[PDB]
């Protein structure tokens, strides 16, 4: 089996099947003569290879991947066990979407196999969670969850967006399906939105012909698929740099007097979350002071991003409501990019002093 | 109000807000800086322009026509609600209803939209959505949208019309009373068969809900800015292309109606034609095999002429009786007449018909 | 032979050769395995078909097409006969570019065969001109020029940008090569820059392997080539509308008191007229336009307008402008595809504001 | 001054000037409203200028577009151009079968030998053009030294920096006047676009833009390709680091193989200054061994280019120069067993395995 880097650049493609083109031609065509799109097929095969899965499916967005998958596997009466902490729109989709169509939802600490097995019911059909989780980015025992899951043949779905198949491969640990917001690290350059699902040919075929075909129509543009593949070609190199930069920044943040503590890392790629002693006011001043980090909500970009939930995404909520969603007043999340670490340290240092 | 052609080229865009660029820059970016309080311009422009063409208040762009339909229905319906559908629908749409949302507690009921008497009789306190294509198979008969709208308001039912076949250039359901219009922009709107996309147009209130609920939470069927830019490029020639599609189809239809191999012409709806081959399924296969200009494919609204014979193509797996149940006769042939020289199209059909014998 | 519209949509392509794709896949690859780019090849073959020529060549821009062609055909000592009036960038290329490398240039009235024949010398190798020409868009006898060129086997090159192969095909009239700024009508949507050269395989091969390969490197991106082919698919329909709109606007402008006369028209959707009020009227006219865009180009879906004296040639003096065939009140319009009633209304109010 | 990686990702762009977009919008428009420049091209140019330490940049349709636009601008009949002993195939063709046929005098000189260069300087010398490093051993030239001589008659020094990229070498900070790049290679890094870049003083670049490009080549770069090039530049430092590491391991391996006569370049660790991920070696078995070696490769691609994520290999004698005779090839610096490799970003163990088996098959 060729190495990860080799497969991320070559898997599934041979120039002679496409006129000798070194780079695969982009099949920007809505239709083909009556007897699949070669560009999407290649992306799917390559992502399947990287995750150690049998088949892949490309979608218009990470949400397209999650919804197409869940709509396929669940029906009224079925139960879904969810990790305690989820993205945002995922939490919304579950509670304000599919959850309002008869599907039962139950949040459980995936870190406690005792509680998980205790929450297992003959109606449980799907176990969905992200690894690691937002809190302190704890890994969670995927193999352990898989063991409990098969009690009622429950399908285990893991959101592997944060790690990418380069750092974690849930399928090799027992998961049935892995989903990605390829919009983040996989693309790596913040210019496209895309989603990926990988698992057995059996499950993926169902999601493709049911969830996607009939219930979401969340198809991915061949042009975007081509750009996503371009990004995947440097995945290993980018993740290495994201991790190194984040490690240095995390160690720096831990020594600063303005920082109460570091939620993570203690590695979640280039992600960091820390707490400002000064709370919401300190967070606002910190964000206003940044000159290199961008004030935005996303991650996995070449550019470093920063967000202060309390004054940004969750500014409308009250302090108590924020706490209920695991959002402290001084919580700051960073997607450390690929810039020179010395410039990133200087930016954070200056902003930290300005936060006072 | 500026003319249709003018709005299809200019509506919603002013070069001054984008560096003086004659053609709007493509915002191929997944994210924007977070609002200071102290949306993607490419998608917003496409949405505003399509809203203008349909005479609606707001527009929403989706990854595909199916993305538009599903995002809309997931938003408006919940378990217990009822949806009245036209008797004949698109394949995937039909499937989405019965094999998709229909399996989540939503009741579906098929009724002849051309029969207002029957429609009114099918209205129940639970009816929340009335969905149909106009025109619809098998004879592309234009349903009375204003009449349906009158009945719908009896229980505040939302009327949704699939306007793919006509495009806003030939029909504008919202101006006739519909609440929402959906499009597979993959067809005529794009016009060049290189992109897949969907559009929903209606009131700001309804579109906002579909955007923030059906799309944001239940489908994630977002449209790529690159594809949106291409769709807008296509819309710039919509009037001219539809004019030619129609002219070519009229000539081919008249020709087909006089040929010995043709039993009848179902229709004439843009450049769409559907006719019956006396020879049935075998004649259909030979006809399809003989075509040299028309392409054997399943779609429509492309610059290239397309042809399909359902019985030996999309519905080849079904039995003759099952096909009939789905409005598919053994000799049914559907044509999406393109923009090629009509003399070349006539010659291709003529020789194929002779070969069908 | 299939009709023009049919060839503009299908010529040179068969889905079977590319995975059954209805639309040709875009070969956005800089390299191919060691034994031509299928996307560029297709564009070239299709343009050759539309012009009635044997071969085509795609370039990064119209200027790329002209320079690549001339650098190939000329060498120090050779003479080039040029039309009395050219684009602008071309005129500069000739005089401030290739002309400073030993190549002799000589302007001649292509409409005057006697003068052209009299300007023919044993050193003449290329006869280059636009048809129609800027002045009053006078067609000019291409077959006549071709007969004279033979005298010393001179190569006749015609810039067919204004007409497009849909309205004029110089090769079928005797020209050796045709060049295009595909940036204009061929693309039709103002989103790409590109050039095209069509002629015999013999000539195009030389231009491809000499002018382009060695002297300009003006290659066209497969992405742009694909967009250009997308545009060509509606060429006949767009040109029909450009022409119809322009005819109506031309008739209107002729009856307006603010207009001295119409230089032209038919040159596609192009119109040129003179404002009685000179440069001041021109400036006010341009400032008032709300639909037409103040820009320098043509062949776009959007209508464009320009007043040379206050725009491209504003730095020159009135006498210098005249030397370049630019009058103080000259206004050029590239009539687009918008609703003619909206275009008439915009021009009408602008003309009243020009006073 | 921000670090290289920071500038390669951010230089010249502020989201607030473009609707807050994190990624710059692509200005795919042929024209703009008449005033009272394309932002996408301008950004690419400013960023490349920053990376090379130059004042201004210019983007072209191809590396050849960059070279021709530059030379057409700077030379006129009677002028003399001093060239490096060995030049890139097409560049050599442009000089001899192109501009060289328009009254411009050409003359090759060993740039590594300042004595010969200084002796080759004439009152007519206007341009000194060369690649650094250059074949056959990829030896670095003393740019500062060449610059000192050039000033004798105000000759403009132009350096093709394609092989190194501004990440590994910056000729302008060494005295060069202009640097040109075939961005088609390393800068893009993914083999999906063709593009050229020129960086130098605002004065020189303005002239090339308004004369060579505007009037003599028309080799403009598509905004779409410019955007892709910028996307590629964002990982330049990381890719070059891997290209270099992979090439070093493969070079050491090749140096120990019985089928290999010698390694032209790179030359051990620290022929100094590794030529990116480029390697050239000689096969003892000549043209026959070269053909078999090439036929056997299963991971490396048989193609003519470099700087791609995918590893490429070529054997000139049986590929680009197959029509020539053995003596003619020698005249062009091509040995019968010469093999050039553009080592890519794949797993080094897979690359080693491929070369290993192809080498055994070459016997």
Swiss-Prot record, chain C:
Disulfide bonds: none
Record note on what altering residue 214 to H/R does: 5 to 14-fold reduction in alpha,gamma-elimination activity against L-methionine, while no change in affinity for L-methionine
EC code: 4.4.1.11, 4.4.1.2
Effect on the protein of changing residue 89 to H: Drastic decrease of the catalytic efficiency of the elimination reaction with L-methionine, by 6700-fold, and increases that with L-cysteine by 7-fold, mainly due to changes in kcat
GO cellular component terms listed in the entry, alphabetical order: cytoplasm
UniProt activity-regulation remark: Irreversibly inactivated by DL-propargylglycine.
PANTHER family tied to this protein: CYSTATHIONINE GAMMA-LYASE, TRANS-SULFURATION ENZYME FAMILY MEMBER
Quaternary organization: Homotetramer; dimer of active dimers.
NCBIfam families: met_gam_lyase, PRK07503.1
The protein's name in its UniProt record: L-methionine gamma-lyase
Taxonomic lineage from the root: Bacteria, Pseudomonadati, Pseudomonadota, Gammaproteobacteria, Pseudomonadales
Swiss-Prot record, chain D:
Gene Ontology biological process: transsulfuration
One Pfam family recorded for the sequence: Cys_Met_Meta_PP
CDD domains for the chain: CGS_like
Necessary cofactors: pyridoxal 5'-phosphate
InterPro entries: Cys/Met-Metab_PyrdxlP-dep_enz, Cys_met_metab_PP, L-Met_gamma_lys, PyrdxlP-dep_Trfase, PyrdxlP-dep_Trfase_major, PyrdxlP-dep_Trfase_small
GO CC terms in record: cytoplasm
Catalytic reaction equation(s): L-methionine + H2O = methanethiol + 2-oxobutanoate + NH4(+); L-homocysteine + H2O = 2-oxobutanoate + hydrogen sulfide + NH4(+) + H(+)
Protein induction: Is under the control of the positive transcriptional regulator MdeR. Forms part of an operon with mdeB.
Top-level taxon in the UniProt lineage: Bacteria
Binding-site list for substrate: 88, 340
Chain positions found as N6-(pyridoxal phosphate)lysine: 185
This protein's UniProt keywords: Lyase, Pyridoxal phosphate
PROSITE patterns recorded: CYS_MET_METAB_PP
Regulation: Irreversibly inactivated by DL-propargylglycine.
Subunit architecture: Homotetramer; dimer of active dimers.
Function: Catalyzes the alpha,gamma-elimination of L-methionine to produce methanethiol, 2-oxobutanoate and ammonia. Is involved in L-methionine catabolism. In fact, shows a multicatalytic function since it also catalyzes gamma-replacement of L-methionine with thiol compounds, alpha,gamma-elimination and gamma-replacement reactions of L-homocysteine and its S-substituted derivatives, O-substituted-L-homoserines and DL-selenomethionine, and, to a lesser extent, alpha,beta-elimination and beta-replacement reactions of L-cysteine, S-methyl-L-cysteine, and O-acetyl-L-serine.
Family: Belongs to the trans-sulfuration enzymes family. L-methionine gamma-lyase subfamily.
Protein name listed in UniProt: L-methionine gamma-lyase
Organism whose genome encodes this protein: Pseudomonas putida
């Amino acid at each position: 089996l060729p190495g990860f880097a080799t497969r991320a650049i070559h898997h599934g493609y041979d120039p002679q099947d496409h006129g000798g083109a070194l780079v695969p031609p982009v099949y920007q065509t809505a239709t083909f003569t009556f007897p699949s799109n070669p560009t999407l097929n290649l992306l799917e095969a390559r992502m399947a290879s990287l995750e150690g899965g049998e088949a892949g499916l490309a979608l218009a967005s990470g949400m397209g991947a999650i919804t197409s998958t869940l709509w396929t596997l669940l029906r009224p009466g079925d139960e879904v066990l969810l990790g305690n902490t989820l993205y945002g729109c995922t939490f919304a989709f579950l509670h304000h979407g599919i959850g309002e169509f008869g599907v039962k939802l139950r949040h459980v600490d995936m870190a406690d196999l005792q509680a998980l097995e205790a929450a297992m019911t003959p109606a449980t059909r799907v176990i969905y969670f992200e690894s690691p989780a937002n809190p302190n980015m704890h890994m969670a025992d995927i193999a352990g969850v898989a063991k409990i899951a098969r009690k009622h043949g429950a399908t285990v779905v893991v959101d592997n967006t944060y790690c990418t198949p380069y750092l974690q491969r849930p399928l090799e640990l027992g998961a049935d399906l892995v989903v990605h917001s390829a919009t983040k690290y996989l693309s790596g350059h913040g210019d496209i939105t895309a989603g990926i699902v990988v698992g057995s040919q059996a499950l993926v075929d169902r999601i493709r012909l049911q969830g996607l075909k009939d219930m979401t129509g969340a198809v991915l543009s061949p042009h975007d698929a081509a750009l996503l593949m371009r990004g995947i070609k440097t995945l290993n190199l980018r993740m290495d740099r994201h991790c190194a930069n984040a490690q240095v920044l995390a160690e720096f943040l831990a020594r600063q007097p303005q920082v109460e503590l570091i939620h993570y890392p203690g590695q979640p790629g280039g992600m960091i979350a820390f707490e400002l002693k000064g709370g919401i006011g300190a967070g606002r001043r910190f964000m206003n002071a940044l000159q290199l980090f961008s004030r935005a909500v996303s991650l996995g970009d070449a550019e470093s991003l920063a967000q202060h939930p309390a004054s940004m995404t969750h500014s409308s909520y009250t302090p108590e409501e924020r706490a209920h969603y695991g959002i402290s007043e001084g919580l700051v999340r960073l997607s450390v990019g690929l810039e020179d670490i010395d410039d990133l340290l200087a930016d954070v240092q200056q902003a930290l002093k300005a936060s006072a």
